[PDB]
Structure formats: C-alpha cells, structure tokens
Design a protein around this nucleic acid. Structure first.
Ligand SMILES: [Mg+2]
Ligand SMILES: [Mg+2]
Ligand SMILES: [Mg+2]
Ligand SMILES: [Mg+2]
Ligand SMILES: [Mg+2]
Ligand SMILES: [Mg+2]
Ligand SMILES: [Mg+2]
Ligand SMILES: [Mg+2]
Lengths: 63, 99, 92, 96
RNA sequence: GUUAAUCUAGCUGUAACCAGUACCGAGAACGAACACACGUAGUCAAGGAGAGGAUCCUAAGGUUAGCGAGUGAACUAUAGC
RNA sequence: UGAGUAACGCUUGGGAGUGAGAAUCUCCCAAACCGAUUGACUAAGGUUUCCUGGACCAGGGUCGUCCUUCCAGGGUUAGUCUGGACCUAAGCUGAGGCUGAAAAGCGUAGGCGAUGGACAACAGGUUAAUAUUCCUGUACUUACAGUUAGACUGAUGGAGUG
RNA sequence: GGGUAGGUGGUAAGAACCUCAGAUCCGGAGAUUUCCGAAUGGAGCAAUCCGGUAGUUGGAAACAGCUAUCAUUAAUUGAUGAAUAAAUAGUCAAUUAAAGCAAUACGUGGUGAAGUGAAACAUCUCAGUAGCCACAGGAAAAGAAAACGAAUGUGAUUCCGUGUGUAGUGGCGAGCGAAAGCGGAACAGGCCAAACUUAUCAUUAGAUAGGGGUUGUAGGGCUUGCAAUGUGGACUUGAAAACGAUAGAAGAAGCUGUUGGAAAGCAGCGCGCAAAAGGGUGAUAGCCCCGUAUUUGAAAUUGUUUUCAUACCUAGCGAGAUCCCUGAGUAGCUCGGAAAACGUUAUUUUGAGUGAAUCUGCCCAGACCAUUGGGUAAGCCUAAAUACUAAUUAGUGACCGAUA
C-alpha cells in the first residue's frame, strides 16, 4: 500500500482538466520518505512515513 | 416403555443389553438376506429399541463403546500350519540336496 | 468392532460354485468405507474362525431402471469374499 | 371428538339408499370416508362384494334408546361429572 | 552405546493397507449431432518370389459392410478398348 | 404440396431348424474381401455397452422370431501388476515478507506436481462372464517380535554412485 | 402439554405388525446430528487419500479397535532467546474474538465508464447511473450551530407538500436546479481534553489510576458564603402483575312432495342467528358435515408494557478580579482538483508548500474593508419519524386462468 503507516492518508483521485477542459482521471500520491523514528521501548524502526506527519514528528520531538 | 428402562442399571446393565441387541439385530438381518425370516417386523422394532437405550446413555454422561473394560477351529488351523511345515520342509530338503 | 461392517451376504450361482470346493470361500457385503483389516477382525468376533485370506471388490454404480420416466442410479457396494482353512465350514 | 366412530350404528340420509341402517367398519378421516357394512356393495369385476365408501356427510347416527328410533344431531358439550367427553343427541338426552 | 544399544547371518511365529481390474479400444461402444467412407499414443506382425513392414496370393484368426429382386434404354461416374 | 419422387451411406448362394409370419434369426456347407490387417494385447477415453433368460410400443434408413435397444437376474476377487502410502522436472501453491486505491499480483522456507527414477511372481488350469488377482506347483520380498552365534553401531549431515 | 381412535409418508392394493396401560398426529424444549464444504492436522482432481500427539483395550510386538486434540491471523499473559554483553527481532506455550454464507432488497464508503442527447462533436449531458470492491446493520448515514440570514426574527438531525420549474447556472445551446421562509410526521440531548488538586512511577513524567469540569444573554477553574436532598433518563439487577405469540375446547336451527341416476334446486309448511365469510356433500344447501360469529384455555419457551425496590450518572442563587484554561502542522495563504443547484466562487473538503492568534480573541452575514449583529471550530456519542421484505401468520383483488 502506497499509504503511510502512522496515519492512513492515501492517494487522492481527481481530474487532469487540461486546457480546453478535456477531463482525464488522475491520481495524487502522498509524498513518502523513509525517515526513522524512535519508540518508547527501544526498537528504533524505519517506517514509510509521509512528509506532513514527518513535520509533526519533527515538532513533537519524536525524531 | 422407557421409564421401565431408566430404572434398570442405567450404567452397566444397559451396555450388556446394547451388545445383545446389536448381535441379534445382525442375525436378524442375515436371516432376512436368505429366507426363513417370517416376521420382517422385528427389525424395525429392535432398531427402535436401541434408539431409546442410547438416548439414556447419552442423557447420562456415558458411551455404548468403552463399557467393555473355536471347537474344531484351532485344530483346523493347526493342520494348516502343519501342512505348511511339510511343504517348507520338502522345499528346503530339495534345495539342500541339489547343492 | 461395532460389527456394522457385515451388512449382508449375497447368494449367487458363482458363490455356490466357489463354495462347494475345499477352501469354502464365503462372501459378504461390507461398509463402503471398511477395509480388509476391519473386515477380518469383525469376522473373528462375529463367528469365531480366524479367516485366512480376505478379498474385496466394489461394484461402481450404473444406471438402473433404464428408460422408465424416472431413471435412477444403482448402489455402491463393496463385496468381500472370505476364505477359510480346508476342514471348516459355517453358515449364516 | 369425531361424529362417527368405528362400531356404532349409522344410517344414510341421502343417496340411492334411504334408511339403509348398518354398522360402520373403517373410517378414513383424512379423505372423509366411511365403510358401512351392508351398503353400496359394488360388484367388482376382478381380472366379489367389497363395499364402497360413503362420505361422512351422508351418514347420520342412529338413536336406539328412544321409542321413536329417529335420527338426530349430536352434542359433545356434555362432559359428565364422572366421565370424559361423550356424545349426546341434541333432540334428546341419550348418551352415545 | 558397555554394565549393552544397534546391526549382520540363520531358526520358530505373525502381518502385508487404499483405489483400478468387466467390456469397446472403432466402416456400429472414444472425438465426429448417427449403427456417419474422417480422425486417435504405444506393443505382437507367419509363408512363397523379393532389398523389405513395398507389391500379388494365402495362413493363425476374423467380417457378410442392416434394403432387396430385375432389366442391361437415353444419360452420369468408374474401369477396359 | 414437392411425393409415395431423390435417398436407403462397399459384399453372396443354398440345405436343415425355429416360428402364426423369414432373403434378413440359429446351425451347417460353401462363397467373397482383410491379412503391417477388418487379426491379437493394452494406454487414453466412454461408463454397464459385458454374461444368461425373456420381449418386439418406440430406436435400427427395409424386415426381424433379432439387435451394441428394452426388461428381470447376474460379473469385476492382488504383499509382487497400473497408481497412492517413496522421489523429484517444467510448473503450481505459498506461512512470514515485498509491492499494489480495492480485489489481487510477486515470492522465500515448506508442500504438491508423471509423461520420468527406485521397489519383490513365474508357468499352467478353471467359470457363461474375472484373472501374473481365484486354484494347483514352485518362489522372492519388506516389516515385526522371540531365539542361536558373530560384531561397537555409525545420521535429519559430508562424499561416491544414481 | 393438546388430543382422540386409528395408524405404519405419495404413485399403494396386498403381506407383517403397533394400538384404545392411551399410538400415529399437533405445539414447545432436548439429544443424535456419516462425508465435503469458511474447512481449519497434512494433502487433494470437492464429497477421497496420508497422518501426528495423549489416553485406554487387545496383542509378545509391529499393528488394529475405542476416545479426545492437532490451521492461520490479531490482542493479552508467561517462558525462552540471536550477530551483541545487556536489550529488541524471532521461537514455544495458554486464553479470548473473526475467517464464511445470504434477503438478486435496502445503507454507507472507495473507484468509475460508454451507449444516448447535443439532431455531427471534444466543454457538457447519460452520471456519480450500471459494474468491481470493502464494511456492517436491523435499519444504516447524519446530527445538537465557529448555524440560518435580515429581523423588536428561527433555535440539533431526518422525512413529506410548497416555495418553483423561481434566484441562479449552462459551447447562456441541449440541459441542470437549490438554500431561506412556510404547513406537517416525530423530538433528547449527553460526555471527554485542558486549567486546579490527589497517589505512585531511578518521579528527569512529558506517564499510570483518581477527584474536578464541559461552555456563548460566554462558561469553568482559583478565594468565600447560602440553599440542596429532591427530579431525571439516551440506563443495571431482582420480584409481582397485565396483555399477547406458539398446539387447541364448546360452538344454534328441517322435514314433506315432483322432474330426477343422485335435489342440496323447484314447490309446500316451518325454524335459528353476536353464525346469510368459506369449503365439501352424486346438480345451486343459512338448518348434512367441517367451520365462522361468540365465549374460552398453556405445563414449557418467547415478546411488549406496567408497578415496587435496586445500583451508575445526573440539581441551584450570590460575593472577589490585569490569576489560569477554553481541542496546532490546526484555521488560513499559495499550486493543482472536487462536494455543493453553480461548468470553481463566497462556504465545505485536499495531494504538495508555507503557517497565526488566545475573550480588547477566533470565524461568519457570495471578492473585500470599517461599523453593527450572529456563533465559539480544529474531540466523542445519540432513540424517534425514514428506506426495504426472500421470510412467519390472517386476508384482499372491476389481477392471470395452461400460447396467460
Ligand atoms: Mg476409421
Ligand atoms: Mg495407433
Ligand atoms: Mg509380407
Ligand atoms: Mg500390402
Ligand atoms: Mg417428379
Ligand atoms: Mg426419377
Ligand atoms: Mg432411386
Ligand atoms: Mg456581506
């Protein structure tokens, strides 16, 4: 699954409304990056996490 | 004719009754296979009998199974093995004489 | 050892032809799932003669009653013949 | 109960036979038939005088305790103090 | 493993389970809508002449090609000339 | 209606018998094709079509006392044969796992998967129908204990062979 | 328990029995419930094959009977344990849940066409329709205002009529089509986070379990007093009672004649009614039968309601003052898209980026600013009216009556 693991925010499906307004179905994929994390039992883990939650992790100092 | 079976030894006499009913039911059916069964109505009854008895040994917590806890036949088998001795002995003697 | 594996004997001309010999091959029909070990143990504990050899065949079902507006199917049965030593013979 | 039981006398109200008093032998309650002895003897031609069933509507019980051996209806409502359900004639009081 | 297990050779005894096993295997039982001139893996494969499983005739064995009986015109197919 | 027209899809002659009825069925005798086959054994398939007795609505390109049709009764017998209980190939499935909006897809260990590898039975006879299966005669194998003698065995793994 | 006098299911006569010591039958509750099948010991060509483990019986032993257990995954608990010393991954064990099916119906959610219309066609419509897929449920979803929107105003949601085919929107073409307001069915609003306080965690707590507190004419906490013992339910256990559902019991009244195969018709003289609904009976029956109206009744199982007790939750008016709290990668802003009636626009959502404030606040009243006025997001829960009926029971039809 190309959704992240902390939350489950998945792709968003929309239209590729070009000039002259021809419609074409298209997908938006979340930005996934392999940044680490540290749990409160040790067990440092590597999880595919999206960037929006990466910022939240960065400010709550969960690394 | 069931309360007259509850009162019986609902633990142990019923097991002997069950084995007797199975045996005589088997011999009934065998008699039915050939001729000489002149009361074909006895089968339906005897099966009908067991249906009650097991129904008791199932209401009580027990089982029909595990309650268990040749006049000239032996002579005929002895003759068979003796003939096998004779044939085997005759065969061995011919093999050892040949060599 | 329920001896529910001796359903019935079959009496045919072939059975008499084979039976009047010396080996005295009886025949029975047994539970379709039964096996030769269970058959011979059952014979031991129903009559009292430890049998010599046991043979089993099965008659696969076929069409029965042919064309009669309600055609049907026959019965799947396992016939086991039971052999006995030379000097012994019992009845059913 | 049942208006007609095996054994009791009974007569015919309608049909080719009138006042054909006789005894009942068999009753088939599922198909509403009765087999009254001495009535509707049809000469079977087997390839014999076996009877022919008569529907329970035609039949009617036969009073035998009144001087006028006439025909009447039946009550069941009489449950005698020392008895179970019984049959009693409406235009009389004669059990069975 | 020795305070003997395990194997080898022999003697006595015991046991050897489950399904298949018929018949057809094709100019009438299979695949072709059929008792349809078609198709379908492998095996056995006699004698004379012959290089041979070719070719002609026969053997072991096996079949009566499930409409006939006539006549012997035109005409058609097939052979012969 | 076309029409009682085309068609009836490779082959004979007779004697005796049966039967109400015969070209058509049973027997006999010839005759004519097959013979690297129309013969004999089996795999694949099909699923009782097999054997005996009976019947002749329908099916049979005619008829029929007869059929591979119909009806009643019957027949298939394994330590060694084909396959499981042993083995694996292509490949299939596939715990965890990887990837994928969803279903699913990919795939590791394991497991399946013969058309192949390894494994011990021959001859003859018998019934209407079965036969390395039943029977007769002679055999071998793989386990199990108990026993006599000898010997220290030596695998879930390594090697050789296969 | 009911219930009588026959019965052993239909093509079904005969044969052999059971039964009026109360069978069959009918209703409630039970037990048995081979094999495959989510299929789950391991396989597999579905309904077959091959087993392990622990007991017991037989046997000298293989071996065979007879019992129970043996899938995976997730959570929790315990044990064990790597490269690496400790630790985690992993492995083993124990307990508890589901995995599937179907009512071709209804609900939500994801994804999502084309035919066709436009007299062609791409924007558009068909259409967020069909289909595929996940997920339940007896109904679901939604929901208690950062609202409507123009006023001395309404006061959760849902559903019906109307507003209206309106205001608008649309290659301003085809077409699409509300939100207010109004009349109605039904009506309930509750609870956490955080301030503060308690106990304990090498108390580095920034964590665990309590108290307390729930918001807008702003509220609550913090300091201090008065009045309270009570309604109230979105609700736990018992007891009692009522009314039902599942077998059933009683249940009025007629003879005569003619045609006639048979009269129940037709005709004569009667009769009964809380029953002239219906079905059968040799032809069209109120009175031949079976029922119906009516009056009744349950050992056992089950439903709705009510009463009494029973927990948990729940209650009110004031005084002090720069005290503290009032849901952060959040609301916005930007780039691409969409839901909304609107073809992108206030409002609402978001894949990417950036990013605030704290009652003198924040948002809103179709771009926007000021004034005035309304409401307090960024946390949760919620019966009722509503949609649907393959199913059980009673019944209906200006519905079909064997090419329907
Ligand atoms: Mg051919
Ligand atoms: Mg060939
Ligand atoms: Mg040759
Ligand atoms: Mg040739
Ligand atoms: Mg002509
Ligand atoms: Mg002509
Ligand atoms: Mg012609
Ligand atoms: Mg404005």
């Amino acid at each position: 699954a190309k959704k992240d693991q902390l939350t489950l925010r998945g792709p968003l499906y929309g239209n590729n409304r070009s000039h002259s307004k021809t419609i074409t179905r298209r997908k938006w994929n979340v930005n996934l990056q392999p940044c680490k994390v540290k749990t409160a039992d040790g067990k440092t883990t590597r999880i595919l996490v999206s960037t929006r939650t990466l910022r939240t992790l960065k400010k709550h100092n969960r690394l | 004719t069931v309360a007259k079976e509850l009162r019986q030894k609902s633990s142990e006499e019923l097991v002997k009754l069950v084995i007797k009913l199975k045996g005589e039911l088997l011999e009934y059916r065998f008699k039915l296979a050939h001729g000489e069964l002149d009361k074909p109505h006895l089968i339906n009854q005897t099966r009908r009998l067991l249906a009650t008895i097991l129904t008791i040994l199932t209401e009580r917590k027990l089982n029909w199974q595990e309650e268990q806890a040749n006049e000239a036949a032996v002579n005929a088998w002895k003759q068979h093995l003796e003939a096998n001795k004779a044939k085997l002995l005759k065969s061995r003697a011919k093999r050892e004489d040949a060599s | 050892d329920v001896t529910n594996v001796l359903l019935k004997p079959v009496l045919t001309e072939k059975v008499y032809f084979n039976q009047m010999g010396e080996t005295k091959k009886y025949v029975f029909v047994v539970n379709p799932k039964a096996s030769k070990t269970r058959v011979k143990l059952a014979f031991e504990l129903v009559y009292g003669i430890k049998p010599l050899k046991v043979n089993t065949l099965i008659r696969k079902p076929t069409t029965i009653r042919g064309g009669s507006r309600f055609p049907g199917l026959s019965k799947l049965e396992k016939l086991a013949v039971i052999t006995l030593p030379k000097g012994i013979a019992i009845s059913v | 109960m049942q208006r007609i039981k095996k054994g009791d006398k009974v007569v015919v109200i309608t049909g080719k036979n009138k006042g054909g008093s006789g005894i009942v032998l068999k009753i088939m309650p599922a198909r509403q038939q009765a087999i009254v002895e001495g009535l509707n003897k049809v000469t079977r031609h087997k390839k014999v005088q076996q009877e022919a069933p008569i529907f329970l509507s035609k039949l009617a019980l036969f009073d035998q305790k009144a001087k006028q051996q006439t025909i009447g209806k039946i009550k069941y409502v009489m449950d005698p103090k020392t008895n179970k359900k019984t049959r009693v004639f409406k235009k009389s009081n004669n059990t069975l």
